[PDB]
Amino acid sequence: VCKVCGQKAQVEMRSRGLALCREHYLDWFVKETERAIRRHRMLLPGERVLVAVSGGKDSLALWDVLSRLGYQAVGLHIELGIGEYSKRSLEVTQAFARERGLELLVVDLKEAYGFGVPELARLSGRVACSACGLSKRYIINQVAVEEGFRVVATGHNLDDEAAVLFGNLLNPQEQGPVLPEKPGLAARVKPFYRFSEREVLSYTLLRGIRYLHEECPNAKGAKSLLYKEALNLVERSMPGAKLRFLDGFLEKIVALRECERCGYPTTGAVCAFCRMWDAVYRRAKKRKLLPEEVSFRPRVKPL
Amino acid sequence: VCKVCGQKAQVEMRSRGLALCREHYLDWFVKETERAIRRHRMLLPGERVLVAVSGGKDSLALWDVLSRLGYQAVGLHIELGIGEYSKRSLEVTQAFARERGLELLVVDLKEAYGFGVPELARLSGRVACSACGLSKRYIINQVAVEEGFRVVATGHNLDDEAAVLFGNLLNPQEQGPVLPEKPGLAARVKPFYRFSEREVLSYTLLRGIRYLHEECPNAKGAKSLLYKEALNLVERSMPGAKLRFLDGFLEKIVALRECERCGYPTTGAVCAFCRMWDAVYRRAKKRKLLPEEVSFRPRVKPL
Numbered sequence: 001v002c003k004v005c006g007q008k009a010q011v012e013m014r015s016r017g018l019a020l021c022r023e024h025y026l027d028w029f030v031k032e033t034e035r036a037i038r039r040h041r042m043l044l045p046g047e048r049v050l051v052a053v054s055g056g057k058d059s060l061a062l063w064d065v066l067s068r069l070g071y072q073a074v075g076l077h078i079e080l081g082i083g084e085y086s087k088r089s090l091e092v093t094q095a096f097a098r099e100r101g102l103e104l105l106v107v108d109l110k111e112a113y114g115f116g117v118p119e120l121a122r123l124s125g126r127v128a129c130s131a132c133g134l135s136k137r138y139i140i141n142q143v144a145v146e147e148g149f150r151v152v153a154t155g156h157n158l159d160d161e162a163a164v165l166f167g168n169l170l171n172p173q174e175q176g177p178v179l180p181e182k183p184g185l186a187a188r189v190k191p192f193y194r195f196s197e198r199e200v201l202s203y204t205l206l207r208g209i210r211y212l213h214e215e216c217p218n219a220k221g222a223k224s225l226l227y228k229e230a231l232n233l234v235e236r237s238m239p240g241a242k243l244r245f246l247d248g249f250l251e252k253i254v255a256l257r258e259c260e261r262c263g264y265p266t267t268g269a270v271c272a273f274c275r276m277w278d279a280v281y282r283r284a285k286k287r288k289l290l291p292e293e294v295s296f297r298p299r300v301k302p303l
Numbered sequence: 304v305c306k307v308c309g310q311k312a313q314v315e316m317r318s319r320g321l322a323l324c325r326e327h328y329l330d331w332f333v334k335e336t337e338r339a340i341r342r343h344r345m346l347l348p349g350e351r352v353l354v355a356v357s358g359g360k361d362s363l364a365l366w367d368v369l370s371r372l373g374y375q376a377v378g379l380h381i382e383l384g385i386g387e388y389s390k391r392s393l394e395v396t397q398a399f400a401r402e403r404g405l406e407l408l409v410v411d412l413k414e415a416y417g418f419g420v421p422e423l424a425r426l427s428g429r430v431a432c433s434a435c436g437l438s439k440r441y442i443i444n445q446v447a448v449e450e451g452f453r454v455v456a457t458g459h460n461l462d463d464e465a466a467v468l469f470g471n472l473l474n475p476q477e478q479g480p481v482l483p484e485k486p487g488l489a490a491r492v493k494p495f496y497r498f499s500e501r502e503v504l505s506y507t508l509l510r511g512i513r514y515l516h517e518e519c520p521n522a523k524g525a526k527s528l529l530y531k532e533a534l535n536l537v538e539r540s541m542p543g544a545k546l547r548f549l550d551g552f553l554e555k556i557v558a559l560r561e562c563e564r565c566g567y568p569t570t571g572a573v574c575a576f577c578r579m580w581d582a583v584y585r586r587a588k589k590r591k592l593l594p595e596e597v598s599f600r601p602r603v604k605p606l
């Protein structure tokens with residue numbers, strides 16, 4: 001039965017020995033999120049926070065919770081130009097924001113830089129996921145800094161964190177719930193880092209939030225899915241495995257230069273982002289999808 | 304093709320980018336085993352070594368290889384009294400030793416202590432696997448010390464080592480290829496710790512060694528099977544994962560008292576082995592399968 005009210009439980013979490021009815025699961029989820037924020041000093045009460053929202057279940061749920069917790073949550077969605085997929089992804093995110101009166105920023109990849117993720121993959125040589133992730137992290141950071149946000153919230157859940165940890169162990173040759181802000185670098189927090197993917201999904205469905213069910217025709221996100229399958233196989237027979245795994249690592253145990261192209265932090269002369277888009281533009285000219293006297297002019301960092 | 308002779312390959316190891324014909328796989332396996340022994344100073348050339356052999360594919364293969372490498376390999380088999388299973392397991396081991404002129408020692412659990420693993424589990428309260436493993440490690444060590452062996456070789460393979468490592472990470476609340484000998488403690492080496500289970504099986508089949516195909520009605524060895532499934536799932540799509548996993552850990556980063564009952568090393572007053580068998584005898588008396596004036600008299604340690 002529901003541990004709080006004694007009525008019929010709607011959600012059962014063996015890993016925590018906890019069973020809750022719909023109304024108290026939603027409340028538990030929201031309170032536990034704030035418990036995570038407070039424990040790790042992720043946010044200040046009512047602070048402006050840039051929420052990276054893709055239209056999927058986690059970041060839409062995160063946007064909902066942070067709003068309910070009274071944070072000034074502004075969403076940033078990035079249109080990746082991956083066909084009808086990215087189109088629907090934008091619609092869902094827009095619908096969410098509209099029907100809740102939340103501020104939503106959009107960066108359209110194709111409109112800003114001329115190429116979506118598909119063409120970007122062909123032109124950079126990198127796998128689609130490499131160029132895409134690189135663009136996502138840079139743009140989200142850039143928008144945060146340019147719009148005066150101190151902290152960015154992403155919707156990475158426990159399955160995601162444990163998959164990353166697992167992958168690093170099996171494949172070094174191929175990031176913590178809180179990353180502190182530095183000059184040119186906004187802070188990044190993961191308030192959902194201890195919720196399982198199943199648990200975040202449960203919140204989303206019970207809250208009635210409509211998200212983009214379908215997933216990208218991913219390329220090397222097929223790796224994370226492999227890691228998740230392996231971890232969940234164990235989790236199925238041994239609840240709390242992912243939590244034990246991630247907690248165990250967490251509770252146990254470099255020079256940055258300004259990019260001479262855009263100004264943002266990097267370890268080299270020019271950052272991987274500018275280096276990628278330069279080569280993409282360069283190869284587009286040789287092909288020639290771009291005018292010869294065109295230059296990639298990245299938005300230089302304040303102040 | 305076979306990387307050594309150019310003829311048809313019989314064994315393909317994607318993880319190592321290596322393909323070999325039957326005759327050269329057998330040779331590669333044997334040479335690599337010696338490479339492991341030498342690298343880690345596991346054995347001295349021609350040294351007497353106690354090989355723990357269960358009749359399964361790994362330890363029978365290990366016994367074969369160590370013999371071929373000119374080591375004086377004496378096998379110790381422990382009869383666990385698990386029905387017809389343990390019976391066949393003993394036969395296979397005996398057959399191997401006979402048809403190769405190898406010295407084989409046998410400890411029959413029921414004959415030595417009065418109870419096989421099944422009854423031992425009911426009487427100790429511990430799961431079958433707990434009492435069984437405890438008995439196996441103690442007896443193998445005891446026989447080694449009592450018979451003047453410096454080093455014991457076990458047939459643990461890469462799948463086994465990586466499963467253990469994985470399990471510890473997911474479940475702390477539930478051991479290296481070489482353990483140095485100490486007073487009352489023989490050395491333990493795992494010369495097969497880098498061969499995958501599939502690779503050790505391949506050696507066994509190509510060498511024509513007959514082993515006990517069936518496995519114990521295991522209890523909590525069902526855990527290792529779960530760990531192996533998870534790891535092999537990744538290995539299937541990403542060769543060298545288990546090796547990367549295990550190597551990565553290995554290449555990165557207490558007071559012992561004499562048991563007042565048997566003399567062997569322990570952290571407490573009496574060791575877990577004596578403590579287990581005492582309680583088993585004690586509870587047998589209360590049941591009463593043993594005479595009241597009977598005492599468990601463990602073989603006290605030399606010198």
Ligand SMILES: Nc1ncnc2c1ncn2[C@@H]1O[C@H](COP(=O)(O)OP(=O)(O)NP(=O)(O)O)[C@@H](O)[C@H]1O
Nearest residue numbers: 052053054055056057058059076077078154155156
């Ligand atoms: N196109 C995008 N625009 C903005 N933010 C994004 C985008 N894609 C991902 N993010 C952020 O990055 C986080 C990780 O995304 P992802 O790699 O999709 O894992 P996920 O948990 O399966 N996706 P989601 O369910 O949407 O959070 C998401 O929670 C978002 O917060």
Ligand SMILES: Nc1ncnc2c1ncn2[C@@H]1O[C@H](COP(=O)(O)OP(=O)(O)NP(=O)(O)O)[C@@H](O)[C@H]1O
Nearest residue numbers: 355356357358359360361362379380381457458459
């Ligand atoms: N009954 C036994 N008697 C002697 N030695 C044993 C016995 N059981 C296990 N061992 C040793 O312990 C090692 C690990 O055994 P186990 O837990 O069965 O993993 P395994 O690799 O599946 N078995 P095997 O194929 O026989 O090595 C074996 O290689 C043997 O060397």
Ligand code: SF4
Nearest residue numbers: 129132216218219221
């Ligand atoms: S799946 Fe690969 S490509 Fe599709 S969005 Fe995620 S990263 Fe970019």
Ligand code: SF4
Nearest residue numbers: 432435519521522524
């Ligand atoms: S399976 Fe469990 S019980 Fe059967 S032998 Fe291995 S440990 Fe002892």
Ligand SMILES: [Zn+2]
Nearest residue numbers: 002005021024
């Ligand atoms: Zn309730």
Ligand SMILES: [Zn+2]
Nearest residue numbers: 259262271274
């Ligand atoms: Zn740059």
Ligand SMILES: [Zn+2]
Nearest residue numbers: 305308324327
């Ligand atoms: Zn050959």
Ligand SMILES: [Zn+2]
Nearest residue numbers: 562565574577
């Ligand atoms: Zn003892």
